[PDB]
Amino acid sequence: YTRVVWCAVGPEEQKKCQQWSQQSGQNVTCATASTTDDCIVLVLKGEADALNLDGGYIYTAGKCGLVPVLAENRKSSKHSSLDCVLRPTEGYLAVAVVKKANEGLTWNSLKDKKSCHTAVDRTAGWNIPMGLIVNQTGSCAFDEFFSQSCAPGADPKSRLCALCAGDDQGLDKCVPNSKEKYYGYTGAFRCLAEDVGDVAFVKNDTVWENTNGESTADWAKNLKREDFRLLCLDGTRKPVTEAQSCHLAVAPNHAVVSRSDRAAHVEQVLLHQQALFGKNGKNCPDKFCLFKSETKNLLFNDNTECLAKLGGRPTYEEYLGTEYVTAIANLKKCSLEACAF
């Protein structure tokens, strides 16, 4: 009965979750939904217990009463002897990437260009970019800013979905789950790498993890970092090595969320599950690895070293940080005391 129901988004996450379930002796079980928002609703209804979420969704879930439980922690040498599970998270760098060969494209010449986004409502792929754009154009017509985009989660017949490809069969065009070829960090970067779009809104890590042989995938095998550039807010272009000085914002790490009343049990099971299937996990390589899924970032980002305890039992607002929270609020006035469910 000490069982946690994980919510998987889309059929691919479901498959990994089932594998996890099996390997955990059903200590973790699986529920599936077609979108992250649907998964939030399952948790709210109590039909699922938890799932790991990007900051923009943490905001959505937070307004509905869901709370941060543990955060993804990427590999970072700082805070040196403290173990990963207890090290404070640093956040990731939201960037705008373009092809080096697309010379003369800068932050100041993005209007009417083609764009690639992880999904609507996500931090680096949407909230940070569109927030900055709305800020600068003075207008809410962010839907009319780029000429075409792939923004999974938007209206499939609109220009924001025009560049989306859907699945093998061309179904599910623009669905905000991994069935959409250009969904998420890797999909948005593949969207740029295949020259479907002019700019991709992703994170620093994505560029590195999908270039210079870091990915064996076919569209990525032959990609080289020098062939790419980051767009800085001051109108300059820089090599992908300069992300610490050329990003759009620092984003709060994706984190596990759950209903307040299940938070403690979820944390307990989670800590014990990673001990088994985490980075240096007991059954990890050997049986199952929670933080691997061939660059597809299923359930968790593939670069996660561990899920770390939070600092100061933070509310969702503290977790996200005041800067980011007001930026999201300021952006959502275009489409506070809420929960759109």
Ligand X SMILES: *[C@@H]1O[C@H](CO)[C@@H](O[C@@H]2O[C@H](CO)[C@@H](O)[C@H](O)[C@H]2NC(C)=O)[C@H](O)[C@H]1NC(C)=O
Ligand Y SMILES: *[C@H]1O[C@H](CO)[C@@H](O[C@@H]2O[C@H](CO)[C@@H](O[C@H]3O[C@H](CO)[C@@H](O)[C@H](O)[C@@H]3O)[C@H](O)[C@H]2NC(C)=O)[C@H](O)[C@H]1NC(C)=O
Ligand Z SMILES: CC(=O)N[C@@H]1[C@@H](O)[C@H](O[C@@H]2O[C@H](CO)[C@@H](O)[C@H](O)[C@H]2NC(C)=O)[C@@H](CO)O[C@H]1O
Ligand U SMILES: *[C@@H]1O[C@H](CO)[C@@H](O[C@@H]2O[C@H](CO)[C@@H](O[C@H]3O[C@H](CO)[C@@H](O[C@H]4O[C@H](CO)[C@@H](O)[C@H](O)[C@@H]4O)[C@H](O)[C@@H]3O)[C@H](O)[C@H]2NC(C)=O)[C@H](O)[C@H]1NC(C)=O
* Annotated binding residues: 54, 92, 118, 122, 124-125, 185, 254
* Cβ neighbours of residue 150 closer than 8 Å, sequence gap 6 or more: 115, 116, 117, 160, 161, 162, 163, 164, 165, 174, 180, 182, 187, 188, 191, 196, 197
Question: In the chain, which ranges are E strands?
Answer: 4-9, 28-33, 50-53, 66-74, 92-99, 114-117, 148-150, 199-203, 228-231, 237-238, 249-251, 255-259, 304-308
The nearest distance, CB 311 to Fe ion, in angstroms, is: 19
- C-alpha–C-alpha distance, residues 108 and 234, integer Å: 8
Q: How many residues bind ligand Y (CB under 6 A)?
A: 8
Q: Is 131 in the site for ligand Y (CB under 6 A)?
A: yes
Q: How many residues does the chain have?
A: 341
Work out what residue 2 binds among ligand X, ligand U, ligand Z, none; the CB cut-off runs from 5 to 8 Å by kind. Answer: ligand X
Q: Is 135 in the site for ligand Y (CB under 6 A)?
A: yes
Residues 255-314 contacting ligand U, CB under 6 A: 303
Q: Which is nearer to ligand U, 9 or 230 (CB)?
A: 230
Q: Is 283 in the site for ligand Y (CB under 6 A)?
A: no
Residues 3-62 contacting ligand X, CB under 6 A: 24-25, 27
Q: What is the DSSP letter of 125?
A: I
Please choose, out of 184-192, 252-260, 263-271, 323-331, the segment that lies near ligand Y by the rule CB under 6 A: 323-331
Two tokens, residue 267: 């944390």
The nearest distance, CB 326 to ligand Y, in angstroms, is: 5
Two tokens, residue 84: 């990963």
Question: Binding residues for ligand Z, per CB under 6 A?
Answer: 89-91, 250, 252, 311-312, 318-319, 321-323
- C-alpha–C-alpha distance, residues 56 and 252, integer Å: 9
Q: Which is nearer to ligand U, 81 or 244 (CB)?
A: 244
- Binding residues (CB under 6 A) for ligand U: these are 75-77, 93, 204-205, 208, 214, 243-244, 303
